Subunit: 244 residues, 4 copies
């Protein structure tokens, strides 16, 4: 492979040129995964494939950075945990962009023709990025919870410390764990956003949009499972404890 | 008003300077709507206010452009309708950014303190942008539907024509109405996205995140009402007619 | 209930009508600034105005948050200053989205016709939002620099501590000042981004693209001034110190 | 099931295991390109690699869609070409998000340490994605220009018809070529955007910010070359023709 074409003018996609850019990145191995253009069953199949691969790359990186967050949290390196969660959120937002590409540009008619030939078994439930992100979420939450325990703080404390008008006592440690909580909440909101945009996409490709009233019922229910349910519970606590 | 301050160094927000930039835009009238800083009950109130105003400005512009789309559709100016829907989508994406600003940076504790003093009657159900966008959606859909009728096309036709591999007959008119449908679908997906991001925001401020299992039940149901339900019905039709 | 348009098919109206949602937001004042439809030179005039207004609301709010950041830095409330800079950054990203709206949807031919009917002397150099943002950048930088001095820290020390591999000394205060630094650099990068997208927009409307070899030469040179030039200087010193 | 990491607490593993979802996507091949954890110089190396890989997947897909656009333009399938350019634009926006990820989260100090352990001759000038995109821009522009000729149209005619106020002649083919033009200009603006954000990123890592008065001078001059310089020339001619 020096190219994924054979006929052309300047239309040839030249790659595998031995540059150290390609060597450092292992770009030829990555480009090797694309369905060769001699085996595409549809002009839109590549687009379908590439958006999945971009997502899976972002999700494996999210996993990696969450493992680092656990290390930082277990060693009280709270400022360094913050950066890991912020980076994970940025990567999650790429997966959102990627599924919205399908919503905006994948023709339902192409998808139905393609799907009418799939192994009728290819389900995103088997996605490694998704399964592993779900697994690592429990250790991640445990590490944050124990850090809050060791500091002698309650979740209501770190939540309240985000408000400049809140007058209770603070330390450098409690405000750092506040920043961590806020960054974890933003990551979780971004993953929930992915689930909601993936839903909108599915309604536009397989039907089932609920305003009118293919295992859509389980999908709609799974689409509201948070990464960190304890953060959302704490939000609900604050409403009941502080509201009027 | 030459300023929204009184004490300062270079910290003064100088405005109302008579420039023709300000005159053309009526910027002094717009800046006049901000709660004066002598009457703010909380440092986060301005942020709350400004994100609403940005949204309402985008929604009134969406309304304006949809009225233009109706004109173009009623006169068979399909290429010009496309641009109106594309512009409306871009504006809708601003409202999404704006509600995600609250999710990411509005402290729940500030909101609860602020809300603990609101007229306990200020509901987004009274939003002019939202109500008027809901009203105009029916005329908008009617105008598109009649245009498809006059051309002698079915919705399944315009949907199928988005796929390059589809072999049925096309005209310039049918592919133009295909582009219009696609742009309308993207607008509707963006408004559904707003409703979903507004939901995530509310779960993070008032609780009620459904994975754990304040009129949240009606909100969750209204959050799946589409602007153009007939487009989503047609997506469901295509699944049943073309799938295996 | 008022009305931004008069002779219509009734379902194509917009309304302004005294609810508490509108009262709390001063919404009727804000919508009052829109150019009346009885007075529009061109159908694209509303769009032109609204993207400016959205931008100006974002910039006035940026200023308000930078003032709060100055207050936090002067009192050594470093964690609280971080949140202010991050909020400013997200507001800045709304201005980027607003100017790209014009790049993507404002027809050059409507801009040229509108520029003829428009006061020849109206210029964005008179933006209150842009002008006050440049004025407030000086005290913001001073407050950060003073806070770093009081802590007895080196700006190069602050930069190095963002790296997990860095082995030198860390306190809680130095790592907090590190997070402030990074948040400040993200804000400045966002504003540079605005300047760059505004340039791309001007090239597509008034011509002047530099690769082809009306106050353009100043605009390009102005487009490279940072809000916090010292942070970019500090980035240059670190390269000579560690990358040669 | 394989594993991108070995000695762990079991819930912190990543897996690769033969489902049809993985088979259809060639996912195991694609994840194989990630640098093994046993071989990473620095914890920020994975992040560095993944943002490049995501970018390169996006660019190879852009190329594939531009090839399709050439095919559509050569056969006068103008509506179909529009969809290809819009898809390319959204893919380009993923590359922008990917490089801003480095601007916002890659520590300069890790980049300098990593740049030392890295082959001194590796350069983005050898990007297959970037290189093929520049090569394919020439036939893309030719196909568009030829299509406009065959229609007997003026590029200024095509520009004017984007305006709803324009009164001159319009056919279905001229307005289709107008939509193609606008989609092409949005793509080029997106790529200019990438170049500008890449510059901002380089300034924050290698120094070199131009407002402070290592192949920087070429990079800045390269950052202003468009993919379709004729469209920007055409924008300049329209200003002299109509804005003086
Ligand atoms: C970037 C593209 C996509 C990615 C990364 C992706 C990923 C996923 C993931 C992770 C799940 C498990 C979701 C959960 O448990 O909440 C899932 C399920 C599902 N996906 Fe997607 N998906 C993509 C595109 C699509 C498309 C284009 C369709 C159909 C047109 C689709 C249809 C479904 C359905 C019906 C389910 C649930 C039932 C089932 O597993 O078959 N997905 N997908
Ligand atoms: C940019 C900011 C916001 C905008 C433009 C906005 C707008 C709206 C709109 C249009 C509705 C009607 C929704 C529907 O029928 O589906 C609504 C309802 C609602 N909003 Fe939001 N909202 C904003 C922020 C908030 C915040 C910060 C909260 C609470 C923390 C909130 C709580 C609610 C609730 C509970 C409802 C439904 C029940 C009710 O009307 O009280 N909103 N809002
Ligand atoms: C959409 C909202 C817009 C905003 C908020 C805005 C704001 C600004 C600002 C703040 C400046 C000063 C730049 C600096 O000093 O670095 C400026 C200058 C300039 N703007 Fe924009 N602008 C907008 C749209 C436009 C449009 C549509 C044009 C169309 C030609 C334009 C053309 C120019 C030019 C040529 C300058 C350079 C100085 C001058 O000739 O007045 N701007 N604008
Ligand atoms: C994140 C993904 C990145 C991609 C996809 C990428 C791609 C590229 C491309 C395509 C060029 C050629 C530009 C042109 O010819 O106009 C280039 C040049 C360059 N890149 Fe980036 N780049 C990335 C990250 C970085 C980073 C982190 C640095 C850090 C210093 C960097 C530094 C440079 C420099 C200095 C040049 C100019 C020529 C040279 O010295 O090699 N790039 N890069
Ligand atoms: C689950 C979904 C699918 C989602 N992502 C996929 C990737 C490769 C193959 C198939 C898929 C599949 N098209 C479905 O309709 O269920
Ligand atoms: C409906 C929501 C509200 C939403 N947007 C608002 C604007 C101004 C005043 C109040 C609101 C309100 N805070 C609530 O909790 O119901
Ligand atoms: C500076 C620019 C302008 C930019 N923003 C504006 C707002 C209102 C009136 C004019 C403007 C103006 N159109 C120009 O061509 O110089
Ligand atoms: C050109 C740039 C580089 C940019 N992208 C890369 C990918 C792999 C290795 C190196 C690079 C490189 N770091 C440099 O400083 O020149």
């Amino acid at each position: 492979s020096l190219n994924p074409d054979e006929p052309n003018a300047l239309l040839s996609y030249d790659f595998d040129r031995g540059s150290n850019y390609e060597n450092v990145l292992h770009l030829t191995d990555a480009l090797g995964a694309l369905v060769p253009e001699s085996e595409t069953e549809h002009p839109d199949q590549r687009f379908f494939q590439v958006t999945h691969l971009i997502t899976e790359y972002a999700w494996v990186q999210v996993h990696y950075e969450l493992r680092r967050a656990i290390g930082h949290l277990d060693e009280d390196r709270y400022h360094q945990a913050v950066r890991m969660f912020d980076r994970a959120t940025g990567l999650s937002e790429v997966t959102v962009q990627a599924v919205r590409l399908l919503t905006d540009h994948l023709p339902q008619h192409s998808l139905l023709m393609m799907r009418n030939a799939l192994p009728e078994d290819a389900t995103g439930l088997d996605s490694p990025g998704y399964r592993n992100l779900r697994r690592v979420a429990r250790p991640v939450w445990k590490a944050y919870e124990q850090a809050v325990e060791r500091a002698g703080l309650s979740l209501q404390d770190v939540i309240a410390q985000q408000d400049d008008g809140y007058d209770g006592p603070r330390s450098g440690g409690s405000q750092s764990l506040a920043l961590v909580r806020e960054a974890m909440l933003r990551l979780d909101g971004s993953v929930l956003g992915w689930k909601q945009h993936h839903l909108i996409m599915v309604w536009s490709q397989l039907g089932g949009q609920p305003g009118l009233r293919r295992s859509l019922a389980t999908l709609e229910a799974r689409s509201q499972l948070a990464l960190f349910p304890e953060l959302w519970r704490a939000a609900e606590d604050a409403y009941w404890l502080l509201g009027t």
